[PDB]
Amino acid sequence: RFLKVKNWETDVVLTDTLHLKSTLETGCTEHICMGSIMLPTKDQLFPLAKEFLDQYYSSIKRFGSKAHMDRLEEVNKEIESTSTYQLKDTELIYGAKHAWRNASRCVGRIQWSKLQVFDARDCTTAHGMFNYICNHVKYATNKGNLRSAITIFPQRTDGKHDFRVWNSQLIRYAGYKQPDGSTLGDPANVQFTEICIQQGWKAPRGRFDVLPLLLQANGNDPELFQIPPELVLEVPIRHPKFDWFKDLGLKWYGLPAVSNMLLEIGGLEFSACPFSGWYMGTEIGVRDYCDNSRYNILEEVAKKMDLDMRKTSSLWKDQALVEINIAVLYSFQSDKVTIVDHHSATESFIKHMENEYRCRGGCPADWVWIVPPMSGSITPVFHQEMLNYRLTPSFEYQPDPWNTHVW
Amino acid sequence: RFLKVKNWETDVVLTDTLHLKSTLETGCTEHICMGSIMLPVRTKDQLFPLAKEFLDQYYSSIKRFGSKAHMDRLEEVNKEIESTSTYQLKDTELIYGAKHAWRNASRCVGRIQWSKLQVFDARDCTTAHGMFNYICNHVKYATNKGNLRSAITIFPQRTDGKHDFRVWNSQLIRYAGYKQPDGSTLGDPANVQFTEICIQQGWKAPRGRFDVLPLLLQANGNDPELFQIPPELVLEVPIRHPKFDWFKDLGLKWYGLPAVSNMLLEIGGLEFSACPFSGWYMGTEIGVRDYCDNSRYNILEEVAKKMDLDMRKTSSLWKDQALVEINIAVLYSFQSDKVTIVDHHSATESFIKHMENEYRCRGGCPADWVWIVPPMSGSITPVFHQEMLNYRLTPSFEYQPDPWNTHVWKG
Ligand code: HEM
Ligand code: HEM
Ligand SMILES: C[C@H](O)[C@H](O)[C@H]1CNc2nc(N)[nH]c(=O)c2N1
Ligand SMILES: C[C@H](O)[C@H](O)[C@H]1CNc2nc(N)[nH]c(=O)c2N1
Ligand SMILES: CSCCCC(=N)NCCC[C@H](N)C(=O)O
Ligand SMILES: CSCCCC(=N)NCCC[C@H](N)C(=O)O
Ligand SMILES: [Zn+2]
């Protein structure tokens, strides 16, 4: 019931007590671990509101004070007559910071308390949504010196007046299925891209076409918008030693801004809540570029390095993978766009774990996601046992809007 | 209850029904996943169901479920248990058991080979010398001059827990570790503690970087005894690189035969506390973990110095760069010397095929993603993208405590 985690590289041992405050369910049982699966009323709202407000007032060292009790009554009265309630700005901000603090799949959490929260609960239309998004993109981009931010649209009511950003990220490249059979651009966005065309997007049909925004306010049908291009910072990808690298014609965007998740604070559901940080280099260089089902560039790159691709055992895939990731990091650095390499980010996360163990009694973390997708065992997180559990406030996955929205 | 697993690269969905036959616990609860935690004398009472289950399984595999021969063997095991408090496995059952423990080993990427396993029955063994002789034969048979063959040697089962056979070594062949007064380590830091015990038991340590450890063998609950494996039976491979002529001057070698000797084999409720088994290496075991772990040989710094990488900023990926060249060297060396080895691309591709076959023919393949995904280049191997279900089937290989922690010394 009190639990220990061991780092097998350093013998450091931490005791987890935070997991007992755990709430939601994991997918695992005592018979079966589901650790590697990607996706495993008024009467209901009040405990959830209480639980959240209890932790809020404890964090500002005002637990069981008049001001605590008063808020608890006030929120109860609001639920009884309105069926929902509204968060104070202070609670909104605390909730968002903590949803990030609790994201067990996020390696970047050492940063959790430096989060700029933009309160868009007064938003009513898609145009409004678009204005809030550009301002987010611009604020967060900051001419390359990226700053974490989240923009929070109004909460769910009856589930028929939902706010949603249909894109999976604010900024992503298009994907087109071709007559030849293969895919041009980003195969991960093929279906979303079709929807844009269907809604009227004039697609350029290139390899790196920044997608338009598809925004849904108050459960209305969604509308298309083009982010001003002067707002979309991109990095052409070159290599510090290989002059020929430029001719592969690779670029990526500087701002990763996940836009399809649901933020749950104190039982309330914010279905549109795009947030952004900055990239760890492997996200682009390993995953986006080398996933077989993404840009899948290993074959082309290895060809240019004149490696022996006859047998898997020459580790040609591995050699190329390294240089691709050297080139991503080098390019971002040379253009002064914030980026972090996987050594430095995992090292920071180990320091963060220690801090959370020491100040909070633990830190939920999903080893499967924390360990980078290259050079795993040479990063310290590989050797670190982690306990995964589900704390609230949280970010959660939610069904894609098109499978659900009624036109 | 059917369970689905998806490969996010191919969109192949599989359906697990096998997990329904699982008994043992995971360490996970509905509230906590312990999927990354490394380590999460029986009664007559508890033993017959365990026997029955196993024999029900054995007899189904041979298409003789419910046969007279099946019933008679149940009644015979039943009687033997009441009369003697334990029972003996027939040869066939032991072979089937050992193969299934491998088949059930959720952390093993090499399981496509599970049906080709040479089983050496060492249940007639009574002394440490007897153990040494069995072990020597296992090593020579498995090595087979570089054309490695899987094998396991099975020493007598636990009786009252006071008469255990144990191999105190963690692998049959492994290099000494030596902690120096100045705090550095010579040789493999992973074996310092076992090395000290050896020294204390009377081993004369050569005190070099790659000294093959002596075998430390416990028979019948007696104190263990030391034995040098004949060096002519220890196949080793000097490590060189196909293009970097300086690589050899690092002085690295490794042994060809990986043979885990510290695990416990459970079959039909019976506990075989000494059951060394061997396969062959996947390249990364040596070139990533054994050479490049900070708590192992830790050669990344020295290799990157010789390649002249930018070592001032971690974002040069100097570590990743050296890591690949080291692994190229390991594979090159083994292949050039004709010692079986498998790269992590080919081994993981094989596992995916095995796993798919196992779903079609068995209703599942329990698998531990944390261990199956290789320690370098994870996502460019198909297993990274494969959803897995981990659960515990018997027969099985279990962890057991280190014997120097439990052993009652006789003197
Ligand atoms: C500041 C720098 C940040 C870094 C370096 C970082 C890093 C990462 C990485 C590498 C992942 C795995 C994502 C993937 O492989 O697709 C991840 C996931 C995640 N991050 Fe962070 N992140 C940062 C900021 C943030 C912020 C500001 C938030 C929320 C306010 C956040 C919340 C999350 C969540 C919820 C996930 C899991 C999302 C999913 O399941 O796809 N991150 N992060
Ligand atoms: C034939 C070639 C084989 C290959 C390439 C192979 C590969 C591997 C690898 C890479 C691991 C993880 C090892 C580590 O990281 O320390 C492993 C674990 C394991 N293997 Fe296999 N293996 C093979 C044969 C066998 C055999 C013959 C057995 C038993 C009959 C076996 C049983 C196991 C078990 C029980 C584990 C988990 C051990 C632990 O938790 O420390 N393997 N295998
Ligand atoms: C099947 C497996 O869970 C899946 O591939 C996961 C593994 N780890 C991951 N880790 C990160 N950071 N991102 C991912 O998309 C994934 N995919
Ligand atoms: C903490 C973590 O579980 C531990 O480092 C594991 C991770 N994955 C592993 N995978 C393999 N194959 N072998 C190992 O020793 C480990 N170590
Ligand atoms: C906004 S999410 C965390 C913030 C910054 C980040 N680095 N992670 C985003 C996931 C991006 C995805 N892996 C990609 O490679 O585009
Ligand atoms: C005998 S166990 C499986 C058979 C062979 C194997 N490949 N795995 C053994 C573990 C070896 C360990 N990783 C090492 O680096 O020595
Ligand atoms: Zn689990």
PDB file of N, CA, C and O and ligand atoms in Angstrom, chain A residues 6 8 367 381-385, chain B residues 35-38 107 289 370-373, ligand 4:
ATOM      1  N   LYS A   6      12.757   1.844  -7.552  1.00  0.00           N
ATOM      2  CA  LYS A   6      14.206   1.753  -7.499  1.00  0.00           C
ATOM      3  C   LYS A   6      14.793   2.192  -8.829  1.00  0.00           C
ATOM      4  O   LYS A   6      14.281   1.841  -9.895  1.00  0.00           O
ATOM      5  N   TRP A   8      17.813   1.397 -11.043  1.00  0.00           N
ATOM      6  CA  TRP A   8      18.743   0.261 -11.080  1.00  0.00           C
ATOM      7  C   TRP A   8      20.152   0.639 -11.525  1.00  0.00           C
ATOM      8  O   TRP A   8      21.044  -0.201 -11.541  1.00  0.00           O
ATOM      9  N   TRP A 367       6.218   4.499 -18.072  1.00  0.00           N
ATOM     10  CA  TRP A 367       7.566   4.185 -18.559  1.00  0.00           C
ATOM     11  C   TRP A 367       7.554   3.982 -20.071  1.00  0.00           C
ATOM     12  O   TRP A 367       8.478   4.401 -20.775  1.00  0.00           O
ATOM     13  N   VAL A 381      16.086   7.426 -17.566  1.00  0.00           N
ATOM     14  CA  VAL A 381      14.690   6.986 -17.359  1.00  0.00           C
ATOM     15  C   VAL A 381      14.485   5.497 -17.646  1.00  0.00           C
ATOM     16  O   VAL A 381      13.634   4.852 -17.035  1.00  0.00           O
ATOM     17  N   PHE A 382      15.283   4.933 -18.546  1.00  0.00           N
ATOM     18  CA  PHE A 382      15.224   3.483 -18.809  1.00  0.00           C
ATOM     19  C   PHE A 382      15.414   2.638 -17.546  1.00  0.00           C
ATOM     20  O   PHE A 382      14.713   1.631 -17.346  1.00  0.00           O
ATOM     21  N   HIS A 383      16.348   3.055 -16.694  1.00  0.00           N
ATOM     22  CA  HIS A 383      16.684   2.287 -15.504  1.00  0.00           C
ATOM     23  C   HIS A 383      15.816   2.600 -14.274  1.00  0.00           C
ATOM     24  O   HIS A 383      16.005   2.008 -13.202  1.00  0.00           O
ATOM     25  N   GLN A 384      14.848   3.480 -14.445  1.00  0.00           N
ATOM     26  CA  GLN A 384      14.061   3.989 -13.353  1.00  0.00           C
ATOM     27  C   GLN A 384      12.720   3.277 -13.294  1.00  0.00           C
ATOM     28  O   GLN A 384      11.883   3.448 -14.190  1.00  0.00           O
ATOM     29  N   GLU A 385      12.442   2.573 -12.225  1.00  0.00           N
ATOM     30  CA  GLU A 385      11.078   2.091 -12.063  1.00  0.00           C
ATOM     31  C   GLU A 385      10.113   3.262 -11.867  1.00  0.00           C
ATOM     32  O   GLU A 385      10.460   4.274 -11.225  1.00  0.00           O
TER      33      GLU A 385
ATOM     34  N   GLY B  35       3.800  -2.266 -14.325  1.00  0.00           N
ATOM     35  CA  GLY B  35       4.385  -2.829 -15.535  1.00  0.00           C
ATOM     36  C   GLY B  35       5.870  -2.567 -15.758  1.00  0.00           C
ATOM     37  O   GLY B  35       6.505  -3.289 -16.524  1.00  0.00           O
ATOM     38  N   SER B  36       6.423  -1.531 -15.111  1.00  0.00           N
ATOM     39  CA  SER B  36       7.887  -1.267 -15.187  1.00  0.00           C
ATOM     40  C   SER B  36       8.731  -1.631 -13.944  1.00  0.00           C
ATOM     41  O   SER B  36       9.961  -1.490 -13.972  1.00  0.00           O
ATOM     42  N   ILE B  37       8.092  -2.101 -12.874  1.00  0.00           N
ATOM     43  CA  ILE B  37       8.819  -2.626 -11.716  1.00  0.00           C
ATOM     44  C   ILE B  37       9.546  -3.932 -12.112  1.00  0.00           C
ATOM     45  O   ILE B  37       8.935  -4.856 -12.671  1.00  0.00           O
ATOM     46  N   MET B  38      10.854  -3.970 -11.841  1.00  0.00           N
ATOM     47  CA  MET B  38      11.735  -5.089 -12.216  1.00  0.00           C
ATOM     48  C   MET B  38      11.348  -6.420 -11.531  1.00  0.00           C
ATOM     49  O   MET B  38      11.203  -7.447 -12.205  1.00  0.00           O
ATOM     50  N   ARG B 107       8.935 -11.982 -20.997  1.00  0.00           N
ATOM     51  CA  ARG B 107       9.999 -11.007 -21.238  1.00  0.00           C
ATOM     52  C   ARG B 107      11.012 -11.503 -22.287  1.00  0.00           C
ATOM     53  O   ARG B 107      11.988 -10.814 -22.543  1.00  0.00           O
ATOM     54  N   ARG B 289      23.722  -2.801 -23.419  1.00  0.00           N
ATOM     55  CA  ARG B 289      23.631  -3.013 -21.964  1.00  0.00           C
ATOM     56  C   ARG B 289      24.972  -3.400 -21.289  1.00  0.00           C
ATOM     57  O   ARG B 289      25.454  -2.676 -20.399  1.00  0.00           O
ATOM     58  N   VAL B 370       8.016  -3.692 -21.930  1.00  0.00           N
ATOM     59  CA  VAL B 370       9.158  -3.025 -21.299  1.00  0.00           C
ATOM     60  C   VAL B 370      10.462  -3.792 -21.587  1.00  0.00           C
ATOM     61  O   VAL B 370      11.523  -3.186 -21.844  1.00  0.00           O
ATOM     62  N   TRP B 371      10.369  -5.126 -21.630  1.00  0.00           N
ATOM     63  CA  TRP B 371      11.505  -5.941 -21.880  1.00  0.00           C
ATOM     64  C   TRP B 371      11.670  -6.330 -23.350  1.00  0.00           C
ATOM     65  O   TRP B 371      12.800  -6.556 -23.793  1.00  0.00           O
ATOM     66  N   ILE B 372      10.570  -6.447 -24.093  1.00  0.00           N
ATOM     67  CA  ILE B 372      10.625  -6.912 -25.470  1.00  0.00           C
ATOM     68  C   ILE B 372      11.258  -5.848 -26.377  1.00  0.00           C
ATOM     69  O   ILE B 372      12.063  -6.163 -27.228  1.00  0.00           O
ATOM     70  N   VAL B 373      10.899  -4.585 -26.184  1.00  0.00           N
ATOM     71  CA  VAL B 373      11.473  -3.496 -26.987  1.00  0.00           C
ATOM     72  C   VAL B 373      12.971  -3.321 -26.678  1.00  0.00           C
ATOM     73  O   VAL B 373      13.385  -3.240 -25.518  1.00  0.00           O
TER      74      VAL B 373
HETATM   75  C1  LIG C   4      13.155  -0.044 -14.572  1.00  0.00           C
HETATM   76  C2  LIG C   4      13.047  -0.978 -15.772  1.00  0.00           C
HETATM   77  O1  LIG C   4      11.933  -1.858 -15.645  1.00  0.00           O
HETATM   78  C3  LIG C   4      14.316  -1.768 -15.997  1.00  0.00           C
HETATM   79  O2  LIG C   4      15.339  -0.830 -16.358  1.00  0.00           O
HETATM   80  C4  LIG C   4      14.167  -2.741 -17.156  1.00  0.00           C
HETATM   81  C5  LIG C   4      13.625  -2.011 -18.396  1.00  0.00           C
HETATM   82  N1  LIG C   4      13.681  -2.921 -19.548  1.00  0.00           N
HETATM   83  C6  LIG C   4      14.549  -3.969 -19.600  1.00  0.00           C
HETATM   84  N2  LIG C   4      14.546  -4.757 -20.685  1.00  0.00           N
HETATM   85  C7  LIG C   4      15.441  -5.795 -20.783  1.00  0.00           C
HETATM   86  N3  LIG C   4      15.413  -6.593 -21.867  1.00  0.00           N
HETATM   87  N4  LIG C   4      16.337  -6.060 -19.800  1.00  0.00           N
HETATM   88  C8  LIG C   4      16.384  -5.265 -18.705  1.00  0.00           C
HETATM   89  O3  LIG C   4      17.232  -5.536 -17.812  1.00  0.00           O
HETATM   90  C9  LIG C   4      15.472  -4.201 -18.583  1.00  0.00           C
HETATM   91  N5  LIG C   4      15.440  -3.400 -17.489  1.00  0.00           N
END
